[PDB]
PDB file of C-alpha atoms and ligand atoms in Angstrom:
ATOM      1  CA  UNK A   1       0.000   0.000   0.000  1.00 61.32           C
ATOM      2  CA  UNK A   2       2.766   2.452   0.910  1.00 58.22           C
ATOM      3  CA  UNK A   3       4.884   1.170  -2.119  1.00 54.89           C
ATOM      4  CA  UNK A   4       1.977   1.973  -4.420  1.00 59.72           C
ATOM      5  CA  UNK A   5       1.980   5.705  -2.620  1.00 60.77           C
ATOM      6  CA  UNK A   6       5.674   5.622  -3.073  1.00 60.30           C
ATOM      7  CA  UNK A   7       5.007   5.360  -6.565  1.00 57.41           C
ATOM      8  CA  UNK A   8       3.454   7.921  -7.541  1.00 59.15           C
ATOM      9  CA  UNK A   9       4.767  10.370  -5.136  1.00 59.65           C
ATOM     10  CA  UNK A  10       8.623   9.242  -6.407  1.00 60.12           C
ATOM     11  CA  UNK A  11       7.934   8.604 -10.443  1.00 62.05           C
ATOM     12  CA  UNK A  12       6.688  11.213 -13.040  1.00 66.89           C
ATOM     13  CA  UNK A  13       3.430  10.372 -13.711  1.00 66.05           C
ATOM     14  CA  UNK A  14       4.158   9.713 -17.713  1.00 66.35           C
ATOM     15  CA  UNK A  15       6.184   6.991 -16.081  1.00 66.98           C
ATOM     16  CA  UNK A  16       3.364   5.428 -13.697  1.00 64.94           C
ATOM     17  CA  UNK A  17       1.360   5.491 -16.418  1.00 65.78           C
ATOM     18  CA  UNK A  18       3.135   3.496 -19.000  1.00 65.92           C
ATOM     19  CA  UNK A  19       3.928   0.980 -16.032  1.00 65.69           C
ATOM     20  CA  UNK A  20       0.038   0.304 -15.022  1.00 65.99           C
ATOM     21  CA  UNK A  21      -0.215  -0.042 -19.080  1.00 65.99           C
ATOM     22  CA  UNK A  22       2.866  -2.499 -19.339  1.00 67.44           C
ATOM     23  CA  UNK A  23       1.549  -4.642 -15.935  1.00 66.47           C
ATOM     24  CA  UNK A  24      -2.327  -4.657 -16.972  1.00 63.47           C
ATOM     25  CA  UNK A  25      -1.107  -6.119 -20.607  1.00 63.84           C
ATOM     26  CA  UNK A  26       0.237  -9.408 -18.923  1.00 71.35           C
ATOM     27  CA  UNK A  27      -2.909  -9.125 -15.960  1.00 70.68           C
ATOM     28  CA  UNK A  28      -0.922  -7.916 -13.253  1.00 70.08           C
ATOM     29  CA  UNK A  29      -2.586  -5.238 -10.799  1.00 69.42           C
ATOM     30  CA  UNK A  30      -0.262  -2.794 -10.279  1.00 71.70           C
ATOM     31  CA  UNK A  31      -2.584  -2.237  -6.562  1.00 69.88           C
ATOM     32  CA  UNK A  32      -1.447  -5.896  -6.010  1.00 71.20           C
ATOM     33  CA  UNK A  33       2.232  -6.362  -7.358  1.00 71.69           C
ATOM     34  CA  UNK A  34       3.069  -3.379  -6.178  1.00 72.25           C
ATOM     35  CA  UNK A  35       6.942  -4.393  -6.068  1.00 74.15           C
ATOM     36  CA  UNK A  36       6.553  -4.809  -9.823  1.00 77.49           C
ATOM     37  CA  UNK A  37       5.503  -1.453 -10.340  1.00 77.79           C
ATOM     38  CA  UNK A  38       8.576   0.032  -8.782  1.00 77.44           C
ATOM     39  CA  UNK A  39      11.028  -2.107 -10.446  1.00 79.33           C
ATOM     40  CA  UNK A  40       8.983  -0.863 -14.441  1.00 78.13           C
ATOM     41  CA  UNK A  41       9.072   2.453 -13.231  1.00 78.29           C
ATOM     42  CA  UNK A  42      12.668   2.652 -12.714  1.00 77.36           C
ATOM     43  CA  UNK A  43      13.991   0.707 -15.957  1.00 79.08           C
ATOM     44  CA  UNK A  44      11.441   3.039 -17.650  1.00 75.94           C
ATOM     45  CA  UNK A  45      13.303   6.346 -16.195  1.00 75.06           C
ATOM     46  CA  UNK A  46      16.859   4.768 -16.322  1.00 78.34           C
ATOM     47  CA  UNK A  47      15.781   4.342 -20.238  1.00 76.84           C
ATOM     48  CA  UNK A  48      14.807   7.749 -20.491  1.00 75.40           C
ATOM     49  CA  UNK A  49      17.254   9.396 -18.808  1.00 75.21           C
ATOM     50  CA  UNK A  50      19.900   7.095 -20.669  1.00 76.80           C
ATOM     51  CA  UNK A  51      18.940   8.826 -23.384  1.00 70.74           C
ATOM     52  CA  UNK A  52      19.012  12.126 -22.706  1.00 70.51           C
ATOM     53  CA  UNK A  53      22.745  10.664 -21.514  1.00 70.84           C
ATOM     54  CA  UNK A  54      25.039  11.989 -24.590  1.00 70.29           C
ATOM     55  CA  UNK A  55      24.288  14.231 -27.816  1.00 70.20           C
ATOM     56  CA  UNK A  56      21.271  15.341 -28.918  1.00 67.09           C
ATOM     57  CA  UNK A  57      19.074  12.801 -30.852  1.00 68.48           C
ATOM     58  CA  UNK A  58      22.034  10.128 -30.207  1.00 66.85           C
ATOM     59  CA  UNK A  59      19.086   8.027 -29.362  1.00 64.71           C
ATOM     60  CA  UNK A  60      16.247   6.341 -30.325  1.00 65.15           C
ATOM     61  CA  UNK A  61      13.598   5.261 -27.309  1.00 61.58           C
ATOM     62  CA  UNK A  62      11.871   2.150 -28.394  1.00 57.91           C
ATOM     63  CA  UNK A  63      10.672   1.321 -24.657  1.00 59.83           C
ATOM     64  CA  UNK A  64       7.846   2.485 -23.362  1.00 61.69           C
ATOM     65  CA  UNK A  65       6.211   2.693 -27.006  1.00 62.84           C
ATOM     66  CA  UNK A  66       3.669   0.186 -28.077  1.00 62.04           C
ATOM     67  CA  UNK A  67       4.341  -2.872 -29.962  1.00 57.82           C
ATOM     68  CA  UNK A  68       3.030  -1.442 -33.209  1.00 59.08           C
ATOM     69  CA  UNK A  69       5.390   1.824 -33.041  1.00 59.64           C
ATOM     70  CA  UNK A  70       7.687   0.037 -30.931  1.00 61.40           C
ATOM     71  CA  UNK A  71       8.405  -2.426 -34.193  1.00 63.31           C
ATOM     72  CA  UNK A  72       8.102   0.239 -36.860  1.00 65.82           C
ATOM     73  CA  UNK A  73      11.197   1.849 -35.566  1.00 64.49           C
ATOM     74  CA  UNK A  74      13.158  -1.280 -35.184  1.00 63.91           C
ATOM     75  CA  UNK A  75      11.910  -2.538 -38.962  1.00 65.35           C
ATOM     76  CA  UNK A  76      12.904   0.985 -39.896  1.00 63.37           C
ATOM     77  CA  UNK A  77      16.408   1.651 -38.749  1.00 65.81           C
ATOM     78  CA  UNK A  78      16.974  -2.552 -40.231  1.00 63.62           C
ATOM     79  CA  UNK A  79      16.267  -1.469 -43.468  1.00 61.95           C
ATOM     80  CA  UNK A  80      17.887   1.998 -43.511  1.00 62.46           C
ATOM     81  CA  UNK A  81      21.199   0.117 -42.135  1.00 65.95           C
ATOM     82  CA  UNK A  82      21.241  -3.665 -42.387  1.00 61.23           C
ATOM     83  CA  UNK A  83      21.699  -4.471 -38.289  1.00 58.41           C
ATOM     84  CA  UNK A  84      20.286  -7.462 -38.265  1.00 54.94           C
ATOM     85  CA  UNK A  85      16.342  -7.622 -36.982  1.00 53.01           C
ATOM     86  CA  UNK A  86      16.321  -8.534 -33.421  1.00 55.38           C
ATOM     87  CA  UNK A  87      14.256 -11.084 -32.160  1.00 52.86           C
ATOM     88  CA  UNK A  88      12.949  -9.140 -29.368  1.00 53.30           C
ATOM     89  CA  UNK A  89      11.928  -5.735 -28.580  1.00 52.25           C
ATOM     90  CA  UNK A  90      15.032  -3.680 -27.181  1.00 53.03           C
ATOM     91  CA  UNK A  91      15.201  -0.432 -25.429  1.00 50.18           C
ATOM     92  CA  UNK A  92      17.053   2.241 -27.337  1.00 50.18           C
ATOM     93  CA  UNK A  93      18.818   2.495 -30.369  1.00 49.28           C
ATOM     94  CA  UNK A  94      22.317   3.888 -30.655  1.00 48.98           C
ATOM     95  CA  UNK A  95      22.871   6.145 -33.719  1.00 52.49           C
ATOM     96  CA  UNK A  96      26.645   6.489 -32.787  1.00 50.47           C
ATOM     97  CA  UNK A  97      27.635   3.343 -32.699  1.00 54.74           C
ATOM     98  CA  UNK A  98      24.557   1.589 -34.813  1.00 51.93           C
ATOM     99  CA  UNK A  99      23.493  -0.983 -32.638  1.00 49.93           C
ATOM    100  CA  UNK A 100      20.517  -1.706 -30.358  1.00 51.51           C
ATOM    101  CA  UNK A 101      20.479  -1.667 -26.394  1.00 52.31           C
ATOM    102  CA  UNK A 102      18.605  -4.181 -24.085  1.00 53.66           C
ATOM    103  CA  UNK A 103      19.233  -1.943 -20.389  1.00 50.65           C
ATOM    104  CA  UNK A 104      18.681  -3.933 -17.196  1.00 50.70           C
ATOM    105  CA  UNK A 105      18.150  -2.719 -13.618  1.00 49.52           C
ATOM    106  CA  UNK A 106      18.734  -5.366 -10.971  1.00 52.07           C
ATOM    107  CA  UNK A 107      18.451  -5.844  -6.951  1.00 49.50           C
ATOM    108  CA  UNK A 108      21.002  -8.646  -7.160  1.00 50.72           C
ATOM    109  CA  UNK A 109      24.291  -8.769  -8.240  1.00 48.52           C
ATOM    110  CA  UNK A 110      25.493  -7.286 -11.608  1.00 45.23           C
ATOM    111  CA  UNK A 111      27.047 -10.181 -13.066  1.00 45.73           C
ATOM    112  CA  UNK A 112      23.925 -12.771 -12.261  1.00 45.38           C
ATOM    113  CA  UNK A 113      21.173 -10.661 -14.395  1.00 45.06           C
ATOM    114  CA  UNK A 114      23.782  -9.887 -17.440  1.00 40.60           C
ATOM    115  CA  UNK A 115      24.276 -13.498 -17.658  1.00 38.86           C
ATOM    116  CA  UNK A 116      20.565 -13.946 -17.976  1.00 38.68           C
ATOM    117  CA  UNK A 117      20.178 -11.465 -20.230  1.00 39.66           C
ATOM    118  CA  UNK A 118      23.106 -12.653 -22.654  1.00 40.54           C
ATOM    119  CA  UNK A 119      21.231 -15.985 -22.781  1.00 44.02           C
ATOM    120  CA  UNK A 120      18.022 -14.807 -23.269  1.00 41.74           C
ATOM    121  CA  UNK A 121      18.283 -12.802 -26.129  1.00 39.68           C
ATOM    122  CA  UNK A 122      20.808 -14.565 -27.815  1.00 42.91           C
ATOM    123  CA  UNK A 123      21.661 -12.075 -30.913  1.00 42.50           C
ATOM    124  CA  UNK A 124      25.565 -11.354 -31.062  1.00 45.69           C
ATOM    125  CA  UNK A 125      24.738  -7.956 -32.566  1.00 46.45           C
ATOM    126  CA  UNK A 126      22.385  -6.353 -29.861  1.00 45.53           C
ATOM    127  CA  UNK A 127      24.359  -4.379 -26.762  1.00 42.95           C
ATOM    128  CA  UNK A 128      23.883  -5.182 -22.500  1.00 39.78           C
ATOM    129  CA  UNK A 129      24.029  -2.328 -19.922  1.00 37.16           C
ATOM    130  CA  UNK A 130      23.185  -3.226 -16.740  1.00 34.85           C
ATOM    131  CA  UNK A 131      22.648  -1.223 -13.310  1.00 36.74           C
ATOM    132  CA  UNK A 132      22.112  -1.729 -10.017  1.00 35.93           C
ATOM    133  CA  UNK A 133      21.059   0.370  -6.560  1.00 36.98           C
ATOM    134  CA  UNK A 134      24.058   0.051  -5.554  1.00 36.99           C
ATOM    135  CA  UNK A 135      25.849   1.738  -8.008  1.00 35.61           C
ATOM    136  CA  UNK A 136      27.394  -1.609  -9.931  1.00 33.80           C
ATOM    137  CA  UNK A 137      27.446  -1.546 -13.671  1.00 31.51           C
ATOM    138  CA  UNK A 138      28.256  -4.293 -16.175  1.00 28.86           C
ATOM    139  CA  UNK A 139      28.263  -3.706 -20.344  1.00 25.51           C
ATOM    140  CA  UNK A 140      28.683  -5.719 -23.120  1.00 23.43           C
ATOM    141  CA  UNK A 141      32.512  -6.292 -24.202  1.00 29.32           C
ATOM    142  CA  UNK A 142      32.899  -3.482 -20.945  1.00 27.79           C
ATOM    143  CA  UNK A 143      32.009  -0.910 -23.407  1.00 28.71           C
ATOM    144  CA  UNK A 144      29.747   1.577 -21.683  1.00 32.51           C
ATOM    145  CA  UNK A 145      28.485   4.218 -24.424  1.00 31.83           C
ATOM    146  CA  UNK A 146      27.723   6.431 -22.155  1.00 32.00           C
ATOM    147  CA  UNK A 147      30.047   9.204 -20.648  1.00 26.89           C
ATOM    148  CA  UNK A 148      31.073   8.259 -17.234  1.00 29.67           C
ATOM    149  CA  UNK A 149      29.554  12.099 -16.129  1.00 35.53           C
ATOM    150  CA  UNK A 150      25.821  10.974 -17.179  1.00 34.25           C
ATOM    151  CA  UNK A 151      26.374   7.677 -15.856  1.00 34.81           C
ATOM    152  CA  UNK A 152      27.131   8.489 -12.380  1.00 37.06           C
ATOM    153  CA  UNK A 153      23.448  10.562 -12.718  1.00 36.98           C
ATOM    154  CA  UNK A 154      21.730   7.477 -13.564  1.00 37.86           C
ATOM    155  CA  UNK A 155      23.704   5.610 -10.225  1.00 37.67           C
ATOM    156  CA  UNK A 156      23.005   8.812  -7.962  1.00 36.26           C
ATOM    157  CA  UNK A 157      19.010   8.875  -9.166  1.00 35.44           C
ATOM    158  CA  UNK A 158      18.993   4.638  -8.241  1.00 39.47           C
ATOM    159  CA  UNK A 159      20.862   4.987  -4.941  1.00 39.83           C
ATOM    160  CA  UNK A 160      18.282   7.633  -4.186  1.00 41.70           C
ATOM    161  CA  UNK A 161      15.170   5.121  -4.835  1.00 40.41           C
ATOM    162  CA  UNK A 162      16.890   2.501  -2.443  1.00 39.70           C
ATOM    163  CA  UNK A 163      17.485   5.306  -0.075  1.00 40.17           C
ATOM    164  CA  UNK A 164      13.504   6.758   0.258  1.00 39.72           C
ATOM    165  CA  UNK A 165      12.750   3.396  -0.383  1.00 40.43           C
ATOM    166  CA  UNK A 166      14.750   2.299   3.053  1.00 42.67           C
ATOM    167  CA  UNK A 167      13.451   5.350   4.682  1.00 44.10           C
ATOM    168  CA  UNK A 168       9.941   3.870   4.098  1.00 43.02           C
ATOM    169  CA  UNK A 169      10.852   0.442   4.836  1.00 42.40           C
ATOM    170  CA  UNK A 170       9.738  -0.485   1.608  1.00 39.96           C
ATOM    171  CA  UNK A 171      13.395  -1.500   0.502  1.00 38.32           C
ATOM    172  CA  UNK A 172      14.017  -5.216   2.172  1.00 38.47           C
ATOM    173  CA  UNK A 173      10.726  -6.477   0.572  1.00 36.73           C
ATOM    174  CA  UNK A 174      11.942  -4.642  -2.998  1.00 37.83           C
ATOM    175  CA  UNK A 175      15.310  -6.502  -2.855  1.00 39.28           C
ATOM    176  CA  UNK A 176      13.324  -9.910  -1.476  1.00 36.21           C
ATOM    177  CA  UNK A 177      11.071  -9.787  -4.592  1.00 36.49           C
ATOM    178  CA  UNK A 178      13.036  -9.887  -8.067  1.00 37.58           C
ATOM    179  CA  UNK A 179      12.551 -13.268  -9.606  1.00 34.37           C
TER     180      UNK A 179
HETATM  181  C1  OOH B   1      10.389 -12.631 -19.785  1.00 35.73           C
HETATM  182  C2  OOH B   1       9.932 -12.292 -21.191  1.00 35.73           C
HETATM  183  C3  OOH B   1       8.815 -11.240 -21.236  1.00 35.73           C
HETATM  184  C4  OOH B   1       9.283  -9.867 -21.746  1.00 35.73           C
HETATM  185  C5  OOH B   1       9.249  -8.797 -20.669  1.00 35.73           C
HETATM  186  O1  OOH B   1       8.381  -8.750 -19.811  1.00 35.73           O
HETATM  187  C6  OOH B   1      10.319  -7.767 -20.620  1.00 35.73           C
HETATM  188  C7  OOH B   1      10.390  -6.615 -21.560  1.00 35.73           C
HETATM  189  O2  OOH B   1       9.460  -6.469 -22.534  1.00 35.73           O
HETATM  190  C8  OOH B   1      11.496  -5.632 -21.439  1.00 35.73           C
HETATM  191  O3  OOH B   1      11.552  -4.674 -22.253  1.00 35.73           O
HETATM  192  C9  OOH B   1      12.508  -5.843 -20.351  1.00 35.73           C
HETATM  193  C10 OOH B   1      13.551  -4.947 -20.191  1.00 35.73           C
HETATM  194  O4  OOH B   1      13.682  -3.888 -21.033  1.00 35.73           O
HETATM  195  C11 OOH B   1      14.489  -5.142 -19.180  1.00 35.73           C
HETATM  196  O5  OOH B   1      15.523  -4.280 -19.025  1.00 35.73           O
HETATM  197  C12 OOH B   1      14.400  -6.211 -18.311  1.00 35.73           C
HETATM  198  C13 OOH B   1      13.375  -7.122 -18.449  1.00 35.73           C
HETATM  199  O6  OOH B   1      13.311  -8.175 -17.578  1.00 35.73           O
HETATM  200  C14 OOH B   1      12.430  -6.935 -19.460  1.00 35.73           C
HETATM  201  C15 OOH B   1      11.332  -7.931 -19.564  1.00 35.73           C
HETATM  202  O7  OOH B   1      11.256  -8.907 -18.779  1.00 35.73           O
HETATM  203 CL1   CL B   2       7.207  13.214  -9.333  1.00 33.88          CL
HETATM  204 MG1   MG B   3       8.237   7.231 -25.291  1.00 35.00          MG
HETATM  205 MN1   MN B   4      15.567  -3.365 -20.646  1.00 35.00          MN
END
């Protein structure tokens, strides 16, 4: 209950929004997995302010979009390019360096969720960027596109959540409840 209020007093509500979407898609009630709801809310803002990271329109978000949009863009920067099509839906594009990023936010360790990742997706061409709470990081090849300047921000803005989230006593539960 005071997770849920945590939620919307902590996350913009553009974020909260797309969340309840995402969750209500696969059944879940975001008034009952309430841990859930955190955890989308924060890879949704670490994607978004990820992108905002380094030059202007370095970016493309493809989170957070529906699956209809969400695919046009992919299908679109395939055929203007030749990366190959992923097999899943990643998060951002990278215009830079021309290749997709799948960006992970985890409660464990760093090293646990990027091998989980790796194997799920499969595709040697996409990219891996993980974070934690704690301020851990792990990328693909240890190449971390980012500047280490807007990386830190990202860190900083996580520690912060697992800060008010402690102050709450919302935090052990959080941590208990990734699966
Ligand atoms: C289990 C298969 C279902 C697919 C799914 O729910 C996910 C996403 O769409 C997604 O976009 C996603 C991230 O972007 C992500 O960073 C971590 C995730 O665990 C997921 C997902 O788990
Ligand atoms: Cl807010
Ligand atoms: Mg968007
Ligand atoms: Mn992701």
């Amino acid at each position: 209950g005071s997770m849920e209020d945590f939620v919307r007093q902590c996350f913009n509500p553009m974020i909260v929004e797309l969340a309840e979407k995402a969750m209500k898609e696969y059944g879940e009630d975001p008034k009952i997995e309430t841990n859930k709801f955190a955890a989308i809310c924060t890879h949704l803002e670490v994607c978004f302010m990820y992108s905002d990271g380094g030059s202007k329109h370095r970016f493309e978000i493809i989170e957070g979009r529906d699956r209809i949009m969400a695919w046009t863009v992919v299908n679109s920067i395939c055929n203007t390019t030749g990366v190959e099509k992923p097999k899943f839906l990643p998060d951002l594009y990278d215009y830079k360096e021309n290749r997709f990023i799948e960006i992970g936010v985890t409660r464990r360790e760093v090293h646990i969720y990027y091998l989980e990742k790796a194997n799920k997706i499969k595709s040697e061409k996409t990219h891996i960027h993980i974070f934690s709470f704690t301020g851990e990081e792990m990328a693909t090849k240890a190449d971390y596109t980012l500047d280490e300047e807007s990386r830190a921000r990202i860190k900083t803005r996580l520690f912060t959540i697992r800060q008010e989230m402690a102050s709450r006593s919302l935090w052990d539960s959080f941590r208990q409840s990734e699966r």
